[PDB]
Structure 1
Amino acid sequence: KFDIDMMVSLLRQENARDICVIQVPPEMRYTDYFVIVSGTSTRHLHAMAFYVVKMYKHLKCKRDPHVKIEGKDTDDWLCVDFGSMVIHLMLPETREIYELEKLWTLRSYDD
């Protein structure tokens, strides 16, 4: 079955430098788990996306719709969204430019 645990273990075992997962309350709309992770080079981020969708495809979700990788044309920010958890691979620079963690922990205002 799918849960944040296995994908986080995937990322850590894949040697992804930084991980930060924020759980979104159901009072919001988008999702439940919202993950921001880093990587070395654009090809390494592409590899992380590769492996994550590979396991998501060979594990389960024959009932559930398939998941596309969004951002391939870009090089410094890639992202995936699943039925209930969404992941954002980012180079450290753009990751610290879009101060996402502050937003997803402090929804009620802007930064």
Structure 2
Amino acid sequence: KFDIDMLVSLLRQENARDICVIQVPPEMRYTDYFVIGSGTSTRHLHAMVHYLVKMYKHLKCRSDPYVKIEGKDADDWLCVDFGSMVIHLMLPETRETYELEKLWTLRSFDDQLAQIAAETLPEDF
């Protein structure tokens, strides 16, 4: 079957520079595992994204349906939603800017959360 260990090994085979995997406790109603991946260039991002999906389809998953690929249009962020894991693939420099790992590793202590600001919306008169 297609599981966490197989995909990361496949990611290593295609030479993923940086992979982040965050488990989710049962209380939080989201995917059990959240995965973030780095890739040198958009061409590498396209290649690795295709490889995982092709392996996923080949590696059983018959009960599960085919998985659509999200973000292929973007050259810096591609994300594929599998049954038990979600892999978010981006460039190395793009990785630090978004800091997805901080969001999940620090559930409420992520620095970027504070960066959000508020506004006021008065009427003309």
Same fold (TM over 0.5): yes
Shift of the alpha carbon at 1:95?
A: 1.0
SS in 1 for 2:8: helix
Shift of the alpha carbon at 1:26?
A: 1.5
Q: TM-score, normalised by structure 1?
A: 0.93
Distance 1:19 1:43 in 2: 18
C-alpha contact (below 8 Å) 2:22/2:105 kept by paired residues? yes
Asked if residue 10 in structure 1 is aligned to residue 13 in structure 2, the reply is: no
Distance 1:40 1:110 in 2: 25
* RMSD after superposition: 1.2
C-alpha contact (below 8 Å) 2:18/2:38 kept by paired residues? yes
Distance 1:59 1:110 in 2: 36
SS in 1 for 2:67: coil
Count residues in correspondence: 111
C-alpha contact (below 8 Å) 2:67/2:80 kept by paired residues? yes
Distance 2:26 2:81 in 1: 17
Q: Which stretch of the first structure deviates more once superposed, 28-37 or 67-76?
A: 28-37
Distance 1:49 1:110 in 2: 27
Distance 2:103 2:27 in 1: 16
User: % of aligned pairs identical?
Assistant: 90
Shift of the alpha carbon at 1:44?
A: 0.5
C-alpha contact (below 8 Å) 2:3/2:84 kept by paired residues? no
Distance 1:62 1:22 in 2: 26
Shift of the alpha carbon at 1:108?
A: 2.4
1:10-40 CA-to-partner distances (Å, cap 9, x unmatched) read 0111111111211111211220111111111
Distance 2:35 2:56 in 1: 16
Q: TM-score, normalised by structure 2?
A: 0.83
Alignment gaps of 5+ in structure 2: 112-125
